[PDB]
Design a binder for this molecule. Structure first.
Ligand SMILES: Nc1ncnc2c1ncn2[C@@H]1O[C@H](COP(=O)(O)OP(=O)(O)O)[C@@H](O)[C@H]1O
Lengths: 34, 447, 48
């Protein structure tokens, strides 16, 4: 099948810090694999 | 990868004072030149800076101020500034002087309902309640048979109980058509029953039924909670004079008949004052004496101005704000007598008058700017300078009122912002009170 | 130091990326869905 994924986030709250730490970590986490 | 964002509804509507967010004072109580939406009026804002500390001090009763100054000088805007400066919890009760002419109650008593609505009261009301699915329901009989008790079995996620309750609760359960499997809520202080429909456990039991169904209640059957009520002394006064509490045939029917006002007796306000003093002694209550704002006070009747002598001298009364836009009028109801602001000299001692005054062209430009960015519109400096000129030609309100009509004309004309070519047209389409009075005096043969 | 980690790991860790196997299964569509928080949310969030 096709796959779709959704994330629900509130602008200007605290969840954007969680997304920013998640992006910063995801970029660090890529280079140690490939 | 993808991003999505959503909104689906209109804003709050813009209104004639909606730019006013507070008095725009500094920490010393001096007025800033332009702050919190207001500009100019520094004496009147500094004065209102004393008055917001007068309200918040609570010590005083029936102190009053009269904002006095020409049309458009910001008197009702400053009472709105005070209403914002006090925040939500202190009650601000707006009134227009011509509201006293009721057809149900005397003019001399509409004022007391307004006064008593402006004294707020915060109550830590403990409510104790039974709720659950009704699993059993049985009345217990006695000789003249009469009902002595009802037994209700109640069920919740946390357990079940089987309670002896008063026959007034059974009369309420019958009134509410409560049956086994119904989720119900009862508060023992009011004796008041609410049905919520059959429990979700029964939502499968029929193919077609009228019921909404609800999830089984949670926590114990019998529990108690504080409601931190906000209430006003008027709301105590009226609720006893035509009582809708209790559960009997009479109170159930005072809740149906036409809700006529009534001349509440001075004795009931007396017995209410005693009951709220006991709730303050018990620590259950905090009083929050607030503000009554009688806008357009210059047309209370002389009956009402003379009643205000007894009301402003009460030990109970809220702080009062009046406003008048009027000169040396005749006082209403007198036909002979003329006095400043249209208010009797006898009342004009009992008020700290706040003089409010006309605007410089610079203040009109600055209000028109603060107003334009509140109506949500962009305006070019040459067009805003032209509205400043229209302010000097006419009045602040007409000059403000052109803004939205000019923005509609601009977006019809395909521009993003008000250009001078838009205001210069709107000025030709819509007359003001001064320019219309010229053509209406020249053509006076035909109106 | 990344190349040292890779030369340590190569003899005792396997690797893929799904496209080295999944010639005929979909990639995810992934949506960052923003939400406007409500009045009761703004009131409590501002109080915090
Ligand atoms: N000092 C001020 N700062 C900001 N807005 C003002 C000020 N004075 C008047 N206004 C605004 O100009 C208009 C006229 O003032 P208003 O309070 O309605 O006058 P009035 O005292 O005669 O009833 C209203 O839109 C009001 O909000």
């Amino acid at each position: 099948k096709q796959v779709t994924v959704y994330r629900l986030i509130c602008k200007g709250t605290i969840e954007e810090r969680i997304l920013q730490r998640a992006k910063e970590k995801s970029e660090i986490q890529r280079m140690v694999i490939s | 990868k993808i991003e999505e964002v959503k909104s689906t509804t209109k804003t709050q509507r813009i209104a004639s004072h909606s730019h006013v967010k507070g008095l725009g004072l500094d920490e010393s109580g001096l007025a800033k030149q332009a702050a919190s939406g207001l500009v100019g009026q520094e004496n009147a804002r500094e004065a209102c800076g004393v008055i917001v500390e007068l309200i918040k001090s609570k010590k005083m009763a029936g102190r009053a101020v009269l904002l006095a100054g020409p049309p458009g000088t910001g008197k009702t805007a400053l009472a709105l500034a005070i209403a914002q400066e006090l925040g939500s919890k202190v009650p601000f009760c707006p009134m227009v002087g011509s509201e006293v002419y009721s057809t149900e109650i005397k003019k001399t008593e509409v004022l007391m309902e307004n006064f008593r609505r402006a004294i707020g009261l915060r109550i830590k009301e403990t409510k104790e309640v039974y709720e659950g699915e009704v699993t059993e329901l049985t009345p217990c009989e006695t000789e003249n048979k009469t009902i002595s008790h009802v037994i209700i079995g109640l069920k919740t996620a946390k357990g079940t109980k089987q309670l002896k309750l008063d026959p007034s609760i059974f009369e309420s359960l019958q009134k509410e058509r409560v049956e086994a499997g119904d989720v119900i809520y009862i508060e023992a202080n009011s004796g008041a029953v609410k049905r919520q429909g059959r429990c979700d456990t029964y939502a499968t039991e029929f193919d077609l039924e009228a019921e909404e169904y609800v999830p089984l209640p949670k926590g114990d059957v019998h529990k108690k909670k504080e409601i931190i009520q906000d209430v006003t002394l008027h709301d105590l006064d009226v609720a006893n004079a035509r009582p809708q509490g209790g559960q009997d045939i009479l109170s159930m029917m005072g809740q149906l008949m036409k809700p006529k006002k009534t001349e509440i007796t001075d004795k009931l306000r007396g017995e209410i004052n005693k009951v709220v003093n006991k709730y303050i002694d018990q620590g259950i209550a905090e009083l929050v004496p607030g503000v009554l704002f009688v806008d357009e006070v210059h047309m209370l009747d002389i009956e009402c101005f003379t009643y205000l002598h007894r009301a402003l001298e009460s030990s109970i009364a809220p702080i009062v704000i009046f406003a008048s836009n009027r000169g040396n009028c005749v006082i209403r109801g007198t036909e002979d007598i003329t006095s400043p602001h249209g208010i009797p000299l006898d009342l004009l001692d009992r008020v700290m008058i706040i003089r409010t005054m006309l605007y410089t062209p610079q203040e009109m430009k600055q209000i028109i700017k603060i107003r334009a960015q509140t109506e949500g519109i962009n305006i070019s400096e040459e067009a805003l300078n032209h509205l400043g000129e229209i302010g000097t030609k006419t009045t602040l309100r007409y000059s403000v009122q052109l803004l939205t009509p000019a923005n509609l004309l601009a977006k019809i004309n395909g521009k993003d912002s008000i250009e001078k070519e838009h205001v210069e047209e709107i000025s030709e389409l819509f007359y003001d009170a001064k320019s219309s009075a010229k053509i209406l005096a020249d053509q006076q043969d035909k109106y | 130091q990344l190349s040292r980690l890779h030369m340590i790991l190569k003899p005792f860790m396997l690797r893929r990326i799904k496209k080295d196997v999944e010639n005929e299964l979909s990639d995810k569509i992934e949506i960052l869905m923003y939400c406007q928080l409500t009045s009761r949310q703004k009131l409590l969030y501002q109080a915090l």
